[PDB]
């Protein structure tokens, strides 16, 4: 292990983490970026926030961190604290209320060729427009826009590792089914600054809600109330119980409005289908 | 003069906590692991989160930190901050709240012979997918997955600790005297297994971890007392409507529809507890 100690002493003798890890200032840093979705923690329809657990794999070459393994006892790879080297400052541009950048500074794997792999975890809370038109049978499309905050495409270049996010270690979700997932790279150049392109990678997920919870807890009671509402007209008037029955159905719906409001998304972007059905049942009782 | 200071200077004046304690790069560090559960704090069904309090016993060998008690006046143990020694960096992989590490960075105990012991306590919030089918008469299988965050299986491997009789502790250890059972959850089983995977040539370097499977049982007394029994009685009341007279003053529909209203109240009550 003394070879590794000597190596780490040698490499970081005059190393600068402020300075980009290239050999010419005209060089561009290539970062390969991959997203692994470990878990879809929660979709908040009211605030339109999707919270997920991710690993953000980043691969790039550091040209001041090369060595010959033969000169150091055959050591070919080492582990370095990520705070000790330059890193790309990938930021979640559409972060809702979470952390903008990586805050878990795990160790990087440094190879003798200068290749660095850094796979920190993160909890991404990303603003996702929620279309409640078909709720609880709705389909969402949640993106995660990632980019170097302070570096433009002329100094740091980012490319996706794969066409799709890595879902191999994805935990099963009890509320959503990810039908589709895909990552796209975008470059935007402005007329004012035509020599500083701005790059991003957007990972979008298309997710279908599993509606059994709302079917059991919401739709079936309203269906019962709606069904029971027509049968007061088979009651005789002389029994003196028509108003009792109908008013009790109305009171049951009024109590059920507690369940509706606590469960239904409290947003005004559109009328949910379940809300339409609730209003229909109320109006017709 | 305290011989501890001389021993500390001897062990740490030339020491690299960033390098593994291996004489060659391809040698593996073996870690002896035990996990002792102090309290099962809770299982949130809405968040599907198991909150537990544990402490992890982690033993290994550091040849650089080896010493003899004869050369240092009979010292058999030295407590030092854990930041001064190499650590295997064990983390709970299946945490839900983003908290990978331990709660308190306790001292490591360096024994003569190069044996290093670290016993930090931790509060862990882990993912536990709740099987809802038989709620509240349900049992859950919550995993606790421990692994090195940095090193692959060829660099750091795991073994289970042994008790004084030499038997392998391949489970969650619980001190019976100090244990207080959770008010709602009873821990029935807790086997531990050391898994190895990604060992193929195409899969790259091999990986390993330790998975403990807390098989826990719910005690449904609260739901029986407060929800199920009242709901059963109120739902049986509708059978009484068949015996009331079919006249103006029978109040047959009164009984039936008001039982429905009470059941709606129970739906509102139950919506605050069931998983989502």
């Amino acid at each position, epitope marked *: 292990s003394e070879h590794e100690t000597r190596l780490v002493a040698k490499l970081f003798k005059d190393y600068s983490s402020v300075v980009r890890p290239v050999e010419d200032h005209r060089q561009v840093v*290539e970062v390969t970026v991959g997203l692994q979705l470990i878990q879809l923690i929660n979709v908040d329809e009211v605030n339109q926030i999707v919270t997920t657990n991710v690993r953000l794999k980043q*691969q790039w070459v550091d040209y001041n961190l090369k060595w010959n393994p033969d000169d150091y006892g055959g050591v070919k790879k080492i582990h370095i604290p990520s705070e000790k080297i330059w890193r790309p400052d990938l930021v979640l541009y559409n972060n809702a209320d979470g952390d903008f950048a990586i805050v878990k500074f795990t160790k990087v794997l440094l190879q003798y060729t200068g290749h660095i792999t850094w796979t920190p975890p993160a909890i991404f809370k990303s603003y996702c427009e929620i279309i409640v038109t078909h709720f609880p049978f709705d389909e969402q499309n949640c993106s995660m826009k990632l980019g170097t905050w302070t570096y433009d495409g002329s100094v740091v270049a980012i490319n996706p*590792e794969s066409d799709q996010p890595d879902l191999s270690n994805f935990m099963e979700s009890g509320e959503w089914v990810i039908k589709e997932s895909r990552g796209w790279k975008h470059s935007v150049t402005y007329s004012c600054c035509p020599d500083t392109p701005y790059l991003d990678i957007t990972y979008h997920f298309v997710m279908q809600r599993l509606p059994l919870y709302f079917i059991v807890n919401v739709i079936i009671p309203c269906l019962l109330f709606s069904f029971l509402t027509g049968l007061v007209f088979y009651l005789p008037t002389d029994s003196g119980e028509k108003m009792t029955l109908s008013i009790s159905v109305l009171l049951s719906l009024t109590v059920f409005l507690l369940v509706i409001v606590e469960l239904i998304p409290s947003t005004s972007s559109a009328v949910p289908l379940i809300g339409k059905y609730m209003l229909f049942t109320m109006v017709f009782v | 003069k305290n011989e501890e200071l001389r021993l500390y200077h001897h062990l740490f004046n030339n020491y690299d906590p960033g390098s593994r304690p291996v004489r060659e790069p391809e040698d593996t560090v073996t870690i002896s692991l035990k996990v002792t559960l102090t309290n099962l704090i809770s299982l949130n069904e809405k968040e599907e989160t198991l909150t537990t309090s544990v402490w992890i016993g982690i033993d290994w060998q550091d040849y650089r930190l080896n010493y003899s008690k004869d050369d240092f006046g009979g010292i058999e143990t030295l407590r030092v901050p854990s930041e001064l020694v190499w650590l295997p960096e064990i983390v709970l992989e299946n945490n839900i709240d983003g908290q990978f590490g331990v709660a308190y960075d306790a001292n490591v105990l360096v024994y003569e012979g190069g044996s290093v012991t670290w016993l930090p306590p931790a509060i862990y919030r882990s993912v536990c997918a709740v099987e809802v089918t038989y709620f509240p008469f349900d049992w859950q299988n919550c995993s606790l997955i421990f692994r090195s965050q940095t090193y692959n299986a060829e660099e750091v491997e795991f073994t289970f600790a042994v008790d004084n009789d030499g038997k392998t502790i391949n489970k969650i250890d619980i001190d019976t005297e100090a244990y207080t059972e959770n008010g709602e959850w009873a821990i029935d089983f807790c086997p531990g297994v050391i898994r190895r995977h990604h060992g193929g040539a195409t899969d790259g370097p091999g990986e390993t971890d330790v998975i403990y499977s807390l098989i826990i049982r719910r005690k449904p007394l609260f739901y029986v007392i407060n929800i199920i029994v009242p709901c059963v009685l109120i739902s049986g009341l509708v059978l009484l409507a068949y015996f009331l007279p079919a006249q103006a003053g029978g109040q047959k529909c009164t009984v039936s529809i008001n039982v429905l209203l009470a059941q709606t109240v129970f739906l509102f009550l139950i919506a605050q507890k069931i998983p989502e």
Partner: antibody, heavy 115, light 109 residues
Framework: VQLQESGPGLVKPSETLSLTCTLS??????????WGWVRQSPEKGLEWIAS???????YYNPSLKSRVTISLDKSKNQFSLRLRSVTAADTAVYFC????????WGSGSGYNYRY | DIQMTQSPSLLPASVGERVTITCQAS??????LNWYQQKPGKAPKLLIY???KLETGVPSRFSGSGSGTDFNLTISSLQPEDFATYYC??????????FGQGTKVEIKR
């Protein structure tokens, strides 16, 4: 960390020479690397055959372009060469190599590359 | 279609002598040239890149020069582990590569 060749050491004439290169502790989906093949013979010296990018872009020696097919397998982190219509002139030591690409920014021209 | 020509095809030398190896391009390639060293029965090792820059870990005696159609690889003081075959490698903006014929260096007697 390391590249490892594999394939038969003897190919009859008119058959296809098939070789594979495997990576040790490394992925083929990196944007600053091309993966290529270079054959050395005593009569022709070092000679580059073909190179391929992880997105499928491929470049070929003009002399060997017709007979050469370079392919990837990202699942297993391998890349393979197929040289068809093989003859005695193709007896050689075939290396698999990592063509390391550096990028540079030019004002008004975009990215230019060195290898 | 750039062709590289190395010179001499065989360079006898001895330890301590200053050694020079020339490479020449048919066209002008700016400084888009690297130099490799290959021991017998071993893969080539990169020595110089961009025709003048030394790779990490290489001994400082190796030097490279040339900013046009003609390039040089110079060994200031030949070491007994410097006896190897040296190749000049030309690349372009795209990954299209050509190599020199190679220059063998033997101990002189």
């Amino acid at each position: 960390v390391q590249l490892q060749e594999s394939g038969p050491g003897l190919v009859k004439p008119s058959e296809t020479l098939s070789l594979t290169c495997t990576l040790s502790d490394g992925s083929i989906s990196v944007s600053t690397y091309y993966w290529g093949w270079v054959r050395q013979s005593p009569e022709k010296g070092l000679e580059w055959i073909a190179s391929i990018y992880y997105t499928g872009d491929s470049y070929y020696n003009p002399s060997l372009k017709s007979r050469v097919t370079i392919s990837l397998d990202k699942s297993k982190n391998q890349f393979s060469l197929r040289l068809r219509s093989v003859t005695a002139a193709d007896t050689a030591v075939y290396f698999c190599a990592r063509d390391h690409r550096r990028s540079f920014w030019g004002s008004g021209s975009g990215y230019n590359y060195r290898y | 279609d750039i062709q590289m020509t190395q010179s001499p095809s065989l360079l006898p030398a001895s330890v301590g002598e200053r050694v020079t190896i020339t490479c020449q391009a048919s066209q002008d390639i700016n400084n888009y040239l690297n130099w490799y060293q290959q021991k017998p029965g071993k893969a080539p090792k990169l020595l110089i890149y961009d025709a003048s820059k030394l790779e990490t870990g290489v001994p400082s005696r190796f030097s490279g020069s040339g900013s046009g159609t003609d390039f040089n690889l110079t060994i200031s003081s030949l070491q007994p582990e410097d006896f190897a075959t040296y190749y000049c490698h030309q690349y372009g903006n795209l990954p299209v590569h050509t190599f020199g014929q190679g220059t063998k260096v033997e101990i002189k007697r």
